[PDB]
């Protein structure tokens, strides 16, 4: 209709002819209409999507928090198609990443009375009321795009360690997805930083699946382990005590949460202990001795992936600490490891390859 068309001519005022407050005020009034009127939204998307978008994103500045919030709502309310290049008007490195990693959000808006009422009213309706959370959301929802973002991996790790949010799944996923498979020396130093940050978190964070996947992914680059070597025995203790805490779930388990957790902690152990023989000999990891004894005595015909993984990580620990297993114990281990190798060979060359290496010492 007209009505929408004339409304939009009005609200989309030339940004080069207005003050930032007036711009901000028109954007507020636009968001609030769109929030209140699905029909206006359909209209924009069918007929004026490019002009509304170029108007909203003509200027972006992560220091203007209220405008940035409104702009995150627009991106979320009338997103462009995935491959539309006008997504580049929201710079990952200079707008989105800064907003994603800055928890400070103003609690007041400078403005008339009606401006402030309109703002409160919008805030009560928005999916998120600050740009840290909205910008993480936009980034992971619409822009998991994207070439790796420079400075993203350590800045996200720093954001997790400050601990302001109650859920890290999105931060962690974006951190994980911005680790490349063939990092430059510069990426590697960023990866080192981020790993030292995450490895410095409370022991509780070592039970968070998101954080563990980042830690596994970062530790895939062995040069990250060398640059951070003095932190490894400490991480290994934490992980080995956690595994020991839930050892009842290693042989058998009816818990998906506990099983995935043990698999991810053992996968992280494996990453560290197969590459750092000094860390493989950390004393608490050798208390995996107890559990292996349990398993060896009361053999089981059935071996789950978690138990196989435990035994592999154990074989690394035993070898580094100079544990000598009597011939029965060594042959059971060698033998269960060879069977695990036959399973994993078609689907995880990394594990197979670690098993092979270890079997050379058996």
């Amino acid at each position: 209709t007209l009505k929408y068309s004339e409304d939009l001519d009005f609200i989309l005022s030339d940004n080069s002819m207005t003050t930032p407050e007036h711009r901000r005020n028109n954007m507020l009034r636009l968001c609030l209409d769109m929030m209140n009127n699905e029909d206006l939204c359909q209209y924009i998307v069918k007929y004026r999507h490019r002009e509304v978008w170029e108007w909203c994103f003509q200027g972006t500045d992560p220091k203007q928090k209220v405008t940035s919030l409104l702009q995150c709502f627009i991106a979320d309310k009338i997103p462009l198609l995935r491959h539309d290049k006008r997504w580049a008007m929201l710079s990952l490195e200079n707008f989105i990443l800064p907003l994603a990693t800055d928890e400070v959000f103003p609690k007041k808006i400078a403005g008339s009375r009606l401006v402030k009422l309109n703002y409160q009213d919008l805030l009560r309706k928005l999916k998120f009321t600050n740009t840290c959370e909205y910008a993480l959301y936009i980034w992971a929802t619409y822009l998991l795009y994207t070439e790796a973002v420079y400075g993203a991996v350590p800045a996200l790790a720093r954001l997790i360690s400050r601990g302001q949010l109650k859920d890290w799944d999105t931060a962690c996923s974006l951190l994980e997805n911005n680790i490349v498979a063939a990092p430059s020396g510069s990426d590697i130093e960023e990866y080192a930083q981020a790993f030292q940050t995450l490895a410095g978190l409370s022991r509780e964070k070592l039970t968070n699946e998101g954080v563990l996947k980042c830690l596994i992914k970062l530790t895939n680059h062995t040069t990250v382990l060398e640059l951070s070597a003095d932190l490894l025995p400490s991480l290994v203790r934490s992980l080995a005590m956690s595994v020991q805490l839930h050892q009842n779930n290693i042989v058998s388990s009816i818990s998906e949460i506990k099983t995935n957790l043990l698999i991810l902690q053992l996968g992280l152990l494996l990453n560290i202990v197969s590459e750092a023989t000094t860390a493989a000999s950390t004393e608490e990891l050798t208390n995996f001795g107890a559990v292996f004894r349990s398993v060896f005595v009361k053999k089981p015909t059935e071996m789950s992936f978690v138990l196989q993984l435990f035994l592999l990580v154990y074989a690394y620990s035993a070898g580094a600490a100079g544990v000598q297993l009597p011939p029965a114990e060594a042959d059971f281990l060698k033998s269960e490891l060879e069977a695990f190798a036959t399973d994993v060979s078609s689907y995880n060359h990394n594990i197979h390859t670690r098993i092979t290496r270890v079997l050379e010492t058996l």
């Binding site: 995935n260 698999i263 996968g267 494996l270 992936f305 993984l309 060359h349």
Partner: peptide, 11 residues
């Protein structure tokens, strides 16, 4: 299927 099998180790 969606079971954790550590394919993450290979990226």
């Amino acid at each position: 299927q969606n079971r954790e099998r550590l394919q993450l180790l290979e990226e």
